[PDB]
Amino acid sequence: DVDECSLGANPCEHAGKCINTLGSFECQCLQGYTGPRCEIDVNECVSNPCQNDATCLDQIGEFQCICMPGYEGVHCEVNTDECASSPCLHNGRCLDKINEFQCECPTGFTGHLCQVDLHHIL
Amino acid sequence: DVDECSLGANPCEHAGKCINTLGSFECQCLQGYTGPRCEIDVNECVSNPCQNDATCLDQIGEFQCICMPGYEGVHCEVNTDECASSPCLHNGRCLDKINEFQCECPTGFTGHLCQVDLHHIL
Ligand SMILES: *[C@@H]1O[C@@H](C)[C@@H](O)[C@@H](O)[C@@H]1O
Ligand SMILES: *[C@@H]1O[C@@H](C)[C@@H](O)[C@@H](O)[C@@H]1O
Ligand SMILES: [Ca+2]
Ligand SMILES: [Ca+2]
Ligand SMILES: [Ca+2]
Ligand SMILES: [Ca+2]
Ligand SMILES: [Ca+2]
Ligand SMILES: [Ca+2]
Ligand SMILES: [Ca+2]
Numbered sequence: 001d002v003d004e005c006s007l008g009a010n011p012c013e014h015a016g017k018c019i020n021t022l023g024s025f026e027c028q029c030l031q032g033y034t035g036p037r038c039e040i041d042v043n044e045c046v047s048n049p050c051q052n053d054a055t056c057l058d059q060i061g062e063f064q065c066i067c068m069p070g071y072e073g074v075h076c077e078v079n080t081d082e083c084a085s086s087p088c089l090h091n092g093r094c095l096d097k098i099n100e101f102q103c104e105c106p107t108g109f110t111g112h113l114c115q116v117d118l119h120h121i122l
Numbered sequence: 123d124v125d126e127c128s129l130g131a132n133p134c135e136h137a138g139k140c141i142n143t144l145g146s147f148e149c150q151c152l153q154g155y156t157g158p159r160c161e162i163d164v165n166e167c168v169s170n171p172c173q174n175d176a177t178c179l180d181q182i183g184e185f186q187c188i189c190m191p192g193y194e195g196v197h198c199e200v201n202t203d204e205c206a207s208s209p210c211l212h213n214g215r216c217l218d219k220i221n222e223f224q225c226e227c228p229t230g231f232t233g234h235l236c237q238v239d240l241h242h243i244l
Contacts, residue, residue, distance in 0.1 A: 064243070072238045080233050087209045087235065099234045111202050112221045113209065116194045121186070 013038045032061030051077045070099030089114045135160045154183030173199045192221030211236045 004011050004025035005018035012018045012027035016038035019026045029038035045056035050065035054076035057064040067076035083094035088103035092114035095102040105114035108122070126133050126147035127140035134140045134149035138160035141148045151160035167178035172187035176198035179186040189198035205216035210225035214236035217224040227236035230244070 069233070072233070080237055082234055082237070084237065085209070085211055085235055087207070089207055101234075111191070111194070112204055112223075113207055115202055115204070115206065 011037055014041070030061070032059075049075055051075050052079075070097075087113055133159055136163070152183070154181075171197055173197050174201075192219075209235055 001020075001022045003020045005020045010016075010018050011025065012029070013035075014033045015030055016033060017028040019028060027036065027038050029035075032042050032044070034040045034042050041058075041060070043058050044061075044063035045058040048056070049063055050056040050067075052071045053068045054071065055066040057066065065074065065076045067073075070080055070082075072078045072080050079096070079098065081096050082099070082101035083096045086094065087101060088094045088105070090106060090109045092103035092105045092109065095104065103112060103114050105111070108117065108119045110116045110118060123142075123144045125142045127142045132138075132140050133147065134151070135157075136155045137152055138155060139150040141150060149158065149160050151157075154164050154166070156162045156164050163180075163182070165180050166183075166185035167180040170178070171185055172178040172189075174193045175190045176193065177188040179188065187196065187198045189195075192202055192204075194200045194202050201218070201220065203218050204221070204223035205218045208216065209223060210216045210227070212228060212231045214225035214227045214231065217226065225234060225236050227233070230239065230241045232238045232240060
């Protein structure tokens, strides 16, 4: 037997661990590397994990998503609820949109956030 | 002398008060009426009191302004401060616009209202 893990070069790529066997050898790859000699940097983005027009970053052993505005979450799968902070004053009904919200104001109030009091006028 | 205030018709228009004089008469007009016999409904809008593309209503003895969105006040002269209610979360800097606002979020926060916490990701 030749110990392939004790020759001039490590036959395993991307710093995989070489393990000698009788008649051959094997590679123990670092996370994110595949192939008999760890030759392939796995594409973690190949199944399109990033949703809603997000950008997928293909990294070592992982992906990361960069979300479009209005979206959040590991997969950009959550439409952020802009109504969650109750931005509409005076019990205005908050309507959630994409990176935006609308307020439907009760009688006597107007403006984007229902700020403007009209009661004195009428 | 003829009492012009005791003839068939009141010579004063728009329910003005007729006052007899010796040789003539005079009219005491209701508010918002002008002319010797109160013939003219004053145009309270003639000097354009309603600002910022507002609609002026020419009324009896008064005007009223209907403001464009983002404006308030008797003359629609006030640009409503949408930042007044502190809509930006996490000490985001609020920039006032017309019937709208923008948030400039601090490091680690994003979204229209700085809602989205990125600290765990980075
Ligand atoms: C990656 O980032 C996201 C947010 C989008 O702007 C994409 O177009 C870009 O490639
Ligand atoms: C009167 O109302 C204001 C708010 C504007 O919409 C004008 O165009 C209208 O005549
Ligand atoms: Ca061997
Ligand atoms: Ca990868
Ligand atoms: Ca939303
Ligand atoms: Ca808004
Ligand atoms: Ca007279
Ligand atoms: Ca008038
Ligand atoms: Ca404003």
